[PDB]
Design an enzyme around this catalytic site. Structure first.
Site, PDB file in Angstrom:
ATOM      1  N   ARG A 166     -11.519 -79.369 -35.156  1.00  0.00           N
ATOM      2  CA  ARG A 166     -12.578 -80.047 -35.374  1.00  0.00           C
ATOM      3  C   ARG A 166     -12.743 -81.440 -34.842  1.00  0.00           C
ATOM      4  NH1 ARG A 166     -10.560 -85.069 -38.522  1.00  0.00           N
ATOM      5  NH2 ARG A 166      -8.294 -84.418 -37.820  1.00  0.00           N
ATOM      6  N   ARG A 183     -15.778 -67.641 -53.271  1.00  0.00           N
ATOM      7  CA  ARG A 183     -15.550 -66.437 -53.753  1.00  0.00           C
ATOM      8  C   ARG A 183     -14.139 -65.567 -53.056  1.00  0.00           C
TER       9      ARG A 183
HETATM   10  N1  LIG Z   1     -15.211 -88.985 -45.167  1.00  0.00           N
HETATM   11  C1  LIG Z   1     -14.557 -89.208 -43.809  1.00  0.00           C
HETATM   12  C2  LIG Z   1     -14.913 -90.347 -43.197  1.00  0.00           C
HETATM   13  C3  LIG Z   1     -14.246 -90.653 -41.716  1.00  0.00           C
HETATM   14  C4  LIG Z   1     -14.518 -89.252 -41.005  1.00  0.00           C
HETATM   15  O1  LIG Z   1     -15.769 -88.604 -40.820  1.00  0.00           O
HETATM   16  N2  LIG Z   1     -13.423 -88.584 -40.444  1.00  0.00           N
HETATM   17  C5  LIG Z   1     -13.310 -87.632 -39.485  1.00  0.00           C
HETATM   18  C6  LIG Z   1     -12.497 -87.358 -38.438  1.00  0.00           C
HETATM   19  S1  LIG Z   1     -10.842 -87.890 -39.327  1.00  0.00           S
HETATM   20  C7  LIG Z   1     -13.037 -86.056 -40.638  1.00  0.00           C
HETATM   21  O2  LIG Z   1     -12.865 -85.040 -39.611  1.00  0.00           O
HETATM   22  N3  LIG Z   1     -13.029 -86.223 -41.734  1.00  0.00           N
HETATM   23  C8  LIG Z   1     -12.350 -85.174 -42.348  1.00  0.00           C
HETATM   24  C9  LIG Z   1     -12.854 -85.026 -43.753  1.00  0.00           C
HETATM   25  O3  LIG Z   1     -13.742 -85.607 -44.433  1.00  0.00           O
HETATM   26  O4  LIG Z   1     -12.425 -84.023 -44.431  1.00  0.00           O
HETATM   27  C10 LIG Z   1     -13.167 -88.868 -44.042  1.00  0.00           C
HETATM   28  O5  LIG Z   1     -12.774 -88.848 -45.293  1.00  0.00           O
HETATM   29  O6  LIG Z   1     -12.494 -88.533 -43.145  1.00  0.00           O
END
Ligand SMILES: N[C@@H](CCC(=O)N[C@@H](CS)C(=O)NCC(=O)O)C(=O)O
Ligand SMILES: CCCCCCCCCCCCO[C@@H]1O[C@H](CO)[C@@H](O[C@H]2O[C@H](CO)[C@@H](O)[C@H](O)[C@H]2O)[C@H](O)[C@H]1O
Ligand SMILES: CCCCCCCCCCCCO[C@@H]1O[C@H](CO)[C@@H](O[C@H]2O[C@H](CO)[C@@H](O)[C@H](O)[C@H]2O)[C@H](O)[C@H]1O
Ligand SMILES: CCCCCCCCCCCCO[C@@H]1O[C@H](CO)[C@@H](O[C@H]2O[C@H](CO)[C@@H](O)[C@H](O)[C@H]2O)[C@H](O)[C@H]1O
Ligand SMILES: CCCCCCCCCCCCO[C@@H]1O[C@H](CO)[C@@H](O[C@H]2O[C@H](CO)[C@@H](O)[C@H](O)[C@H]2O)[C@H](O)[C@H]1O
Ligand SMILES: CCCCCCCCCCCCO[C@@H]1O[C@H](CO)[C@@H](O[C@H]2O[C@H](CO)[C@@H](O)[C@H](O)[C@H]2O)[C@H](O)[C@H]1O
Ligand SMILES: CCCCCCCCCCCCO[C@@H]1O[C@H](CO)[C@@H](O[C@H]2O[C@H](CO)[C@@H](O)[C@H](O)[C@H]2O)[C@H](O)[C@H]1O
Ligand SMILES: CCCCCCCCCCCCO[C@@H]1O[C@H](CO)[C@@H](O[C@H]2O[C@H](CO)[C@@H](O)[C@H](O)[C@H]2O)[C@H](O)[C@H]1O
Ligand SMILES: CCCCCCCCCCCCO[C@@H]1O[C@H](CO)[C@@H](O[C@H]2O[C@H](CO)[C@@H](O)[C@H](O)[C@H]2O)[C@H](O)[C@H]1O
Ligand SMILES: CCCCCCCCCCCCO[C@@H]1O[C@H](CO)[C@@H](O[C@H]2O[C@H](CO)[C@@H](O)[C@H](O)[C@H]2O)[C@H](O)[C@H]1O
Ligand SMILES: CCCCCCCCCCCCO[C@@H]1O[C@H](CO)[C@@H](O[C@H]2O[C@H](CO)[C@@H](O)[C@H](O)[C@H]2O)[C@H](O)[C@H]1O
Ligand SMILES: N[C@@H](CCC(=O)N[C@@H](CS)C(=O)NCC(=O)O)C(=O)O
Ligand SMILES: N[C@@H](CCC(=O)N[C@@H](CS)C(=O)NCC(=O)O)C(=O)O
Lengths: 146, 146, 146
Positions: free
Chosen positions: A103, A30
């Site tokens: 993060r 929103r």
């Molecule tokens: N689904 C995750 C897999 C690996 C992961 O958990 N990455 C962490 C550290 S790069 C993250 O904060 N991902 C960011 C996100 O998924 O938007 C990704 O696409 O990055």
């Protein structure tokens, strides 16, 4: 049911945390006017969205590990780790929502908490299987002697 | 086994429902020619895709709650909620797939069912921890009186 | 507590496998310099990403099925399917990583294993419920006869 109540509590807490995360996306939808079929928009929406999504995909890993460790190693120890993880994840969601940089620290915290859980679950399973295995192993060396 | 079979049934039904949603996406992928690495395309596909993705991420929330509620509150009541949720989700998937507006109503339905489950799981957990706590509380204020 | 140890083991292995896929995305993220709020980039990254994401959304389906089947039909049989599935998934991730075509073969493999588990879980639950139902059914048709 007695030796599982702590686990179930942490579990429900986790579910509530996830419900919070998804409520925040609905709000950021929103706030930044991003229509439902759309996954993309202003970077501040995208960060909130992606945080929820990262948290969501790790949830089952947390659940699986929480219970496995809680049952095969120690309910209290597993529950405590679960708590640490869940808290770390809230911090991850909030840091990410601010900047894609903030993060990282909480992510590592949660990664440790989750690895610990995996470690406990692993030991608890080894403690279960290894004796029965080594016993059957020695039985093989005794059949030879007699 | 006997005290969890109704839960397990609803669980399996849910799994089937998710399998359905997944197959629908695979269908709409051929129908609207959207190749595998792509998550984006015609509005018709994106709505279908996003519905499945929304349903997928809530699924562990549903499972976790279903069982915690079923075990700590009442198998039958939990299982009936689960059924309500699962049906509402099917409606959500189909509404969304038509227009991103028609997903709203069933989404609320599903949210209610899911919240009720959370509530039941919450009560059931309070019912488990509260008496033992009140016992220890009275033991304290009783140390005073005696 | 131990008529579920094999399940718990395949479960933890599954968690590790997902942990692996997630690490692979993190790696391909640095390798192809795709910043965290972004889901999109070079096809080499996108394929790895999408693989992990597809694996992650089926994971809860696997867990749910693995346990329901393991408990209501046969622990060893369930666990074996789980293993087949898990391995098939590893292959899916790797094939998809190379080309969006090489994902299809292992996907089908994984789909079979998963459907088999659903099948086992279904039988196991029928075996539990169906006696009592058919008995009541015959009683009804028998009340008419006499
Ligand atoms: N689904 C995750 C897999 C690996 C992961 O958990 N990455 C962490 C550290 S790069 C993250 O904060 N991902 C960011 C996100 O998924 O938007 C990704 O696409 O990055
Ligand atoms: C524990 C389980 C609970 C998990 C959380 C899920 C709770 C579900 C509650 C649903 C609340 C959503 O509330 C609803 O959000 C959608 C988008 O998100 C908004 O958006 C809607 O209206 C706007 C008007 O501006 C339209 O342009 C848009 O197409 C439509 O989707 C609605 O104005 C709002 O009423
Ligand atoms: C939603 C609310 C969440 C509440 C979660 C409850 C957390 C409780 C954590 C317990 C702390 C662990 O501490 C452990 O307790 C058990 C209880 O017999 C014993 C162990 O020797 C001890 O190490
Ligand atoms: C150290 C190696 C010694 C091996 C002997 C272990 C015996 O293994 C025991 O098997 C019986 C089955 O009847 C059960 C116990 O939980 C297990 O500990
Ligand atoms: C014990 C119960 C077992 C349930 C197991 C769960 C598996 C899910 C399978 C349920 C399938 C839902 O059933 C679904 O009905 C709707 C009716 O609105 C049909 O809807 C279809 O036709 C209508 C036109 O009439 C179109 O507007 C719509 O776009 C199209 O999808 C679908 O063709 C059908 O797939
Ligand atoms: C501590 C005990 C835990 C067990 C709680 C069980 C709750 C069962 C009652 C169900 C009703 C919940 O209904 C839900 O309430 C929360 C209040 O935080 C609302 O959430 C609202 O406030 C929160 C503030 O924390 C915002 O982050 C959120 O964006 C906003 O929508 C939801 O929009 C509403 O749908
Ligand atoms: C301010 C107003 C607030 C209102 C809140 C009302 C409290 C709601 C709590 C209800 C949850 C109680 O949870 C209750 O747990 C007991 C466990 O002994 C279950 O009981 C079950 O297991 C026990 C074993 O202990 C068996 O004796 C019994 O045959 C079986 O049904 C009940 O099936 C369940 O209903
Ligand atoms: C609950 C499991 C749901 C998994 C969803 C994945 C669906 C996979 C699509 C299946 C399409 C069928 O594709 C065909 O499969 C058969 C038997 O399996 C073989 C053929 O070589 C293949 O062309
Ligand atoms: C309670 C239902 C349990 C059914 C058990 C059957 C398991 C054996 C697998 C066959 C299932 C057929 O399911 C079919 O799969 C193909 C290929 O993926 C597609 C179809 O849309 C789907 O209907
Ligand atoms: C995969 C197919 C499974 C289909 C299962 C169909 C469900 C049939 C409903 C049976 C409901 C019986 O519910 C029964 O209620 C009594 C009340 O005295 C108690 C029992 O513990 C419970 O089993
Ligand atoms: C009917 C279809 C055949 C599938 C039945 C398999 C389940 O068999 C199950 O075995 C376990 C192990 O002792 C016990 C259960 O009561 C029984 O139902
Ligand atoms: N992942 C969800 C989190 C919040 C949510 O569940 N939103 C509901 C209400 S706006 C929804 O139908 N989301 C649409 C979607 O995910 O495609 C999202 O991005 O929207
Ligand atoms: N989320 C899946 C739902 C259906 C599915 O599991 N598709 C299979 C066969 S097309 C797949 O490998 N999807 C590729 C992907 O998700 O990246 C999708 O969007 O495709």
């Amino acid at each position: 049911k007695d030796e599982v109540a702590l686990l179930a509590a942490v579990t429900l807490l986790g579910v509530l945390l996830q419900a919070y995360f998804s409520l925040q996306v609905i709000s950021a939808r929103r706030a930044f006017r991003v229509s439902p079929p759309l996954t993309t928009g202003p970077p501040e929406f995208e960060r909130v969205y992606r945080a929820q999504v990262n948290c969501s995909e790790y949830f089952p890993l947390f659940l699986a590990t929480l219970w496995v460790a809680g049952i095969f190693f120690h309910e209290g120890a597993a529950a405590l780790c679960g708590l640490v993880y869940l808290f770390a994840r809230l911090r991850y969601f909030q840091g990410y929502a601010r900047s894609a940089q903030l993060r990282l620290a909480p992510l590592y915290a949660s990664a440790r908490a989750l690895w610990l859980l995996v470690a406990l679950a692993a030991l608890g399973l080894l403690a279960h299987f290894l004796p029965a295995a080594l016993r059957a192993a020695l039985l093989g060396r005794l059949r030879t002697l007699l």
